[PDB]
Design a protein around this ligand. Structure first.
Ligand SMILES: [Ca+2]
Ligand SMILES: [Ca+2]
Length: 67
């Protein structure tokens, strides 16, 4: 849907394909709830399921969607 994807398009402001923790916090800002840098690091954790040291779009799905 646009909600998830298109807002994700705004989320990736640069459209680089890759999400940083800092951008997680952006999405968090969009979400209303803004967590601090500390938590943003936890965003790497919760968002980084593949374990590459980065947050990607696939993982953006894997974080919310999960399994
Ligand atoms: Ca980005
Ligand atoms: Ca990753």
């Amino acid at each position: 849907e646009e909600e998830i994807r298109e807002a994700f398009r705004v989320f990736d402001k640069d459209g680089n394909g890759y999400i940083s923790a800092a951008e997680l916090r952006h999405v968090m800002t969009n979400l209303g709830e803004k967590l601090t840098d500390e938590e943003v690091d936890e965003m790497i954790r919760e968002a980084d399921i593949d374990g590459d040291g980065q947050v990607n779009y696939e993982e953006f799905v894997q974080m919310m969607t999960a399994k």
